[PDB]
């Protein structure tokens, strides 16, 4: 009977979660920023020295956006003039500061509008990208050596990814990789010459008389993809009297016979490098392993160390092929591959041996490999209590595969079921992050013992504030369809009385390998809707979802917008059948893929749903990018899968929208899910005489994330739902 979690509490962000972002610098030391001072902590004892003060940069002149400290502790890199591009890309200006002679390096500086910078893994070498070309500084104050000369805007990318490689494959802007001790610099080159352009208007400040046309290389499904090449250069032998020599590594002839992608690179040793290539049809992939050839000066990859990976139920990997984790000598490696019955487990390869041995099995999956010592492999899985939505740390004795220890399961089983981990330089220490279902909790441990040292942060500060307010509760459970369990979650209003009729909002994403039903603690729009408005906010992980093995994941292969959409409607039925749900007040909403599903559901004419909200929806797969879309659907040609492309659009269901209240929203500067998609839906509905409301967001992109827009959209949606549910 206090106060509730209000819309303003969400939008103005009055209830803050605290974090503990540390950055390991050694075997036993880490850095942590506090009230604007970077401190160094001693892992063992917890005592801490001041590393650099907030005083230092008072008269820098510019507003500093981000630090970055050379491995050898001697220099510190300063980022300003940050200007965002796409998801991970941006440009900035940079200044280096010498921590010995307490000063800024004034000459031979990094250019304004630099696109990427990185230190070497040891020492203070620098590599940066500027105007699509790569440059190297051996010493902060000395001049930089030019590596590539072909860089050209929107055409040739040297050391940075193009649009589709950034978003869909590497999840980074950076396309360069130092060797472990920093001798070698490997890098990719992307050629976008014949990649079609997407174009859209950008309006800018009202001062701008004529609108600008942004134009971007972007391959829609079936269209012409970029092409890639891979080089390695030696930074020790850089001349300043000669252009520097880059050794290309061609690619598997089994890949060269057609379109392909470079999708993983992993250094194995000081002179050994591993690459993973993938065919445009993403069910066949190939790992190469290359050694430096001291005589020739080149890199040679023997075909008898090559390693194939393929599928017939679907595609390779969760989103792309997994990455190898090599042993110190680099003659064997561990890699998460899918097993005989379709569960993802750790495999153990020898570099020149076709066959591997699985070191884990079970009806559960390894999420990721986290560390490797000479006789222990640390990993994360969803094994504990057979729940896919939970996450825990495990170690496995290398010499004995039946010696598996759980490192996090019983540390605090009621508060903590979703762990992630950050290890020290040689796995001597490790930090755990627990993010649900309780308030996040960060601890610290020593690996020698698996002994818990101290508590780093526990959000007890926030905890006082929160008992003053009537929070909602989260149920996590499953239902059964055709003798397989499918998980779901529900955000329940405070004092939830299981014999009342609550109105229900289905919160959907549902894309391949997604998981909306988990144990994470969140303070978001659903929190407001349950707490203040008494709406049950549910999510369901049906077919296509991940972490439950391949039979469930690959069930939508070549067949998008069929099962995952049906299963959302099914789950909705089962929920009303549970009795505490207002049968005639069910809504649905999602963003991106989620918007597409939402839209396909409302278009299905199932009668289950009163209304829906689709934010930046995909509307027909031929409009979305190739790397993603084709991964699941193949090519939109008659000889391939064009029928399913055509059969699966939102606009074909326009007629059925007559039975629902629809809300369509899209940012005009969406470079990801182009405005085109929503524009085509709206037209289809108009032509069939269906009423709805649209809402554009001038110059907003796929995030609708700018400060004032974020506030505005969540407000506009809230009002829409309240009205559709007859709430006050």
């Amino acid at each position: 009977s206090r106060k509730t979690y209000t819309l303003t509490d969400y939008l103005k962000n009055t209830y803050r979660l605290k974090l503990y972002s540390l950055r390991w610098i050694s075997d036993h030391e880490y850095l942590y920023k506090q009230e604007n001072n970077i401190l160094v902590f001693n892992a063992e004892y917890g005592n801490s020295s001041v590393f650099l003060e907030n005083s230092t940069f008072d008269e820098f002149g510019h507003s500093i956006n981000d630090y970055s400290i050379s491995p050898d502790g001697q220099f510190i890199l300063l980022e300003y003039n940050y200007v965002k591009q796409w998801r991970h890309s941006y440009t900035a200006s940079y200044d280096i500061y010498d921590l010995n002679k307490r000063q800024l390096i004034t000459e031979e500086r990094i250019p304004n509008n630099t696109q990427w910078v990185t230190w070497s893994p040891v020492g203070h070498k620098l590599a940066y990208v500027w105007n699509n070309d790569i440059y190297v500084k051996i010493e902060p104050n000395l001049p930089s050596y030019r590596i590539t000369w072909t860089g050209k805007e929107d055409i040739i990318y040297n050391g940075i990814t193009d649009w589709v490689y950034e978003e869909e494959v590497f999840s980074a802007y950076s396309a360069l990789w130092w060797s472990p001790n920093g001798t070698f610099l490997a890098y990719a080159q992307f050629n976008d010459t014949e990649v079609p352009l997407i174009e859209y208007s950008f309006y800018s400040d009202e001062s701008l008389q004529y609108p600008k046309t942004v134009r971007v290389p972007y391959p829609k499904a079936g269209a012409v993809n970029p092409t890639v090449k891979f080089f390695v250069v030696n930074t020790d032998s850089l001349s300043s009297v000669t252009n520097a020599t880059s050794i290309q590594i061609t690619a598997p002839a089994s890949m060269l016979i057609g379109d392909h992608y470079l999708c993983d690179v992993t250094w194995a040793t000081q002179e050994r490098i591993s690459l993973q290539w993938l065919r445009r049809i993403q069910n066949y992939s190939v790992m190469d392993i290359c050694d430096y050839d001291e005589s020739s000066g080149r890199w040679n990859c023997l075909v008898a160390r090559q390693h194939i990976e393929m599928s017939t139920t679907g595609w390779v990997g969760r989103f792309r092929p997994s990455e190898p984790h090599f042993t110190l000598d680099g003659n064997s490696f561990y890699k998460i591959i899918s097993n005989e019955e379709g569960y993802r487990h750790i495999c153990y390869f020898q570099i020149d041996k076709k066959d591997c041995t699985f070191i884990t099995k079970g009806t559960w999956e390894v999420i990721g490999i986290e560390a490797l010592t000479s006789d222990y492999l640390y990993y994360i899985s969803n094994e504990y209590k057979g729940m896919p939505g939970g996450r825990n740390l495990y170690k496995i004795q290398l010499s004995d595969y039946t010696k598996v220890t759980c490192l996090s399961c019983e540390l605090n089983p009621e508060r903590c079921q979703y762990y992630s981990v950050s290890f020290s330089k040689e796995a001597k220490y490790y930090q755990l992050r627990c993010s649900g279902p309780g308030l996040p909790l960060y601890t610290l441990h020593s690996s020698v013992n698996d002994k818990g040292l101290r508590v780093l942060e526990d959000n007890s500060a926030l905890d006082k504030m929160l008992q003053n307010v009537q929070m909602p509760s989260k149920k996590l459970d499953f239902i059964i369809l055709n003798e397989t369990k499918f998980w779901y979650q529900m955000i329940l209003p405070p004092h939830f009385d299981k014999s009342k009729k609550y109105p229900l909002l289905l919160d959907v994403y549902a894309g391949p390998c997604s998981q909306k039903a988990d144990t994470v603690f969140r303070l978001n729009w659903a929190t407001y809707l349950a707490s203040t408005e008494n709406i049950i906010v549910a999510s369901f992980d049906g077919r296509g979802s991940g972490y439950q093995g391949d039979k469930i994941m690959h069930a939508i292969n070549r067949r998008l917008g069929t099962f995952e959409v049906e299963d959302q409607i099914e789950a909705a039925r089962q929920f009303s059948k549970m009795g505490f749900v207002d049968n005639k007040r069910i809504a649905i909403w999602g963003w991106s893929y989620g918007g597409y599903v939402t839209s396909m559901v409302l278009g299905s004419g199932s009668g289950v749903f009163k209304c829906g909200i689709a934010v930046a929806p995909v509307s027909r797969w031929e409009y979305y990018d190739s790397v993603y879309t084709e991964r699941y659907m193949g090519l939109p040609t008659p000889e391939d899968n064009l029928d399913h492309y055509r059969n699966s659009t939102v606009m074909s269901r326009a007629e059925n929208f007559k039975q629902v209240e629809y809300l369509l929203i899209h940012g005009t500067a969406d470079d990801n899910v182009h405005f085109q998609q929503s524009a085509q839906i709206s037209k289809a509905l108009v032509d069939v005489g269906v009423d709805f409301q649209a809402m554009w967001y001038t110059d907003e992109d796929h995030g609708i994330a700018s400060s004032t827009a974020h506030q505005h959209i969540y407000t506009h949606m809230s009002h829409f739902i309240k009205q559709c549910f007859s709430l006050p």
Binding site: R87, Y509, W591, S592, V618, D625, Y628, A705
Partner: peptide, 6 residues
Amino acid sequence: MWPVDP
């Protein structure tokens, strides 16, 4: 294509 998140 990824989920977004405030």
